[PDB]
Each structure stands twice: as structure tokens, then as C-alpha cells.
Amino acid sequence: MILVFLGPPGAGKGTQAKRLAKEKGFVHISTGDILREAVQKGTPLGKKAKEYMERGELVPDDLIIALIEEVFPKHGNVIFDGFPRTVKQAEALDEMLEKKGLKVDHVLLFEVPDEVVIERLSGRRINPETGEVYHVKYNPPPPGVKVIQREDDKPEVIKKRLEVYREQTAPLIEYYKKKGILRIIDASKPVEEVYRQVLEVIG
Ligand SMILES: Nc1ncnc2c1ncn2[C@@H]1O[C@H](COP(=O)(O)OP(=O)(O)O)[C@@H](O)[C@H]1O
Ligand SMILES: Nc1ncnc2c1ncn2[C@@H]1O[C@H](COP(=O)(O)OP(=O)(O)O)[C@@H](O)[C@H]1O
Numbered sequence: 480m481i482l483v484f485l486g487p488p489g490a491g492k493g494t495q496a497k498r499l500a501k502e503k504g505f506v507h508i509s510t511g512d513i514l515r516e517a518v519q520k521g522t523p524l525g526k527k528a529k530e531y532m533e534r535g536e537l538v539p540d541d542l543i544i545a546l547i548e549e550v551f552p553k554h555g556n557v558i559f560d561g562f563p564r565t566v567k568q569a570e571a572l573d574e575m576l577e578k579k580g581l582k583v584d585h586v587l588l589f590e591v592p593d594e595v596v597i598e599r600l601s602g603r604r605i606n607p608e609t610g611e612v613y614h615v616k617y618n619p620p621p622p623g624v625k626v627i628q629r630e631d632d633k634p635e636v637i638k639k640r641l642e643v644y645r646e647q648t649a650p651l652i653e654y655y656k657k658k659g660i661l662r663i664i665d666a667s668k669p670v671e672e673v674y675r676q677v678l679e680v681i682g
Pocket of ligand 1 (some may be wrong): 487488489493510511512514531532533535536537538539543560561562563564567640
């Protein structure tokens with residue numbers, strides 16, 4: 480089974496993907512996580528990607544498409560989390576999978592309104608030792624635990640990211656809907672409720 484998690488930044492896609500991977504044994508492919516590691520390690524990919532990410536822009540398609548070929552597993556069910564983000568990326572994924580006799584089985588669209596997006600992202604915090612994601616209101620870090628705020632979770636970058644999402648990524652809704660594989664998730668609900676809907680949708 481191959482899943483794609485699609486939707487505005489802050490919808491809770493990462494959070495749900497991590498849970499589903501941990502509990503059901505999917506391979507979680509987070510382009511954001513992988514890129515952040517690349518930036519940290521100072522790889523050719525990292526150095527090139529860094530500025531796009533800090534500015535809230537998408538990293539160029541060719542780099543991401545290569546990244547996906549590099550990390551796609553020989554076996555296992557997969558969650559694509561934050562990929563694809565453009566039509567060109569979605570077409571390259573279809574091609575890549577077709578060559579492997581595979582296809583996207585479900586595209587879960589995590590719907591949230593802008594107000595919730597801003598609230599979720601502005602409050603997002605990361606434990607730098609473990610990568611665990613918290614929220615200052617909805618899931619605060621344990622007392623005493625040091626966390627950081629991502630530079631792209633600052634207000635003006637969130638604004639850019641949402642524009643970029645609406646411009647480049649939202650067309651994917653129609654792209655996948657035509658194929659009859661688009662599943663709507665009400666991502667504005669609490670985490671446990673969203674996860675139950677994720678499980679129902681994928682059977
Ligand atoms: N599939 C992709 N294509 C291009 N850029 C990406 C992709 N995935 C992640 N990025 C880059 O990394 C940034 C953070 O992505 P991600 O962690 O997936 O976003 P979010 O903040 O919604 O969790 C994006 O704004 C973009 O610069
Ligand atoms: N269902 C939810 N209700 C409340 N807060 C949430 C929910 N899902 C995620 N969060 C919090 O909102 C922020 C965005 O979640 P994340 O999974 O990073 O989103 P995405 O991967 O879609 O950008 C994080 O701070 C996370 O702890």
C-alpha cells in the first residue's frame with residue numbers, strides 16, 4: 480500500500496504519519512525531515528536546499544525527485560509525507576511507481592482552515608535531541624525539556640509557505656480527485672480523532 484499525505488502546512492500530516500508508521504509498520508518518507516538532515520549534514524543537497532527552505536519556498540523539483548528515487552524502499556508499505564508538492568513531482572512519482580508495478584493507493588487530504596494553520600505552526604516546537612514535535616498549547620513539551628522553534632515557523636515565513644501551498648500544491652487535489660483516490664480528512668479535530676479517521680480511510 481502506498482499513501483500520500485497532502486494538505487496545508489500545519490495540518491498535522493507529520494504527526495499522523497509518524498504515528499501510522501510506528502504502529503502499523505509503514506515506511507515514513509518525510510521530504511521535510513530528510514531535507515533538514517541534509518541541511519544539517521552540509522551535503523550538496525543540504526547546501527542547495529537550505530535557502531529555499533528558510534524562505535518558505537519549495538526546493539526545486541529535480542532535487543526532490545532525485546531524493547525520492549534515492550530513498551524509496553525496495554519493499555514495505557509507504558507513506559509519502561509532504562511529497563509530492565507540485566504537479567511535476569506528482570507526475571514523476573506516478574512514473575517512478577509505474578516502473579515498479581506500483582501506484583498511489585490513497586491520497587489523504589488533511590483539511591484545515593488558515594486560522595488553524597497559523598495557530599498550529601506558530602506554536603510548533605521541536606525537541607532537538609529526539610526530533611519529537613510538540614505544540615505550546617495542544618501538546619506542550621514536558622517541564623524542563625529544551626525545545627526550539629523552526630525559523631520557517633516564524634510569522635512571515637508561514638505566510639509565504641501558505642501562498643506557495645495554495646499556488647503550487649493545491650492543484651494536486653484535483654489531480655488526485657480525478658483518479659478517484661482522494662480521501663478527505665477533517666484535520667481540524669484533535670489528534671486521536673484524526674488518527675481514527677486515518678485508520679478508517681485506509682481500512
Ligand atoms: N516535496 C517537496 N518539494 C519541495 N520542497 C520541499 C518538499 N518537502 C519539503 N520541502 C521543503 O522543506 C520545507 C519544509 O517542508 P515540510 O517539513 O514538509 O513542511 P511543514 O512545515 O508543512 O512540515 C518546505 O517549505 C520546502 O522548502
Ligand atoms: N490534530 C491536532 N490538533 C492540535 N494540534 C496538532 C494536531 N496535529 C498536529 N498538531 C500540532 O500542530 C503542529 C503541526 O503539526 P505537524 O504534524 O508538524 O503538521 P504538518 O506535518 O502537516 O506540517 C505541531 O506543533 C503539532 O504538535
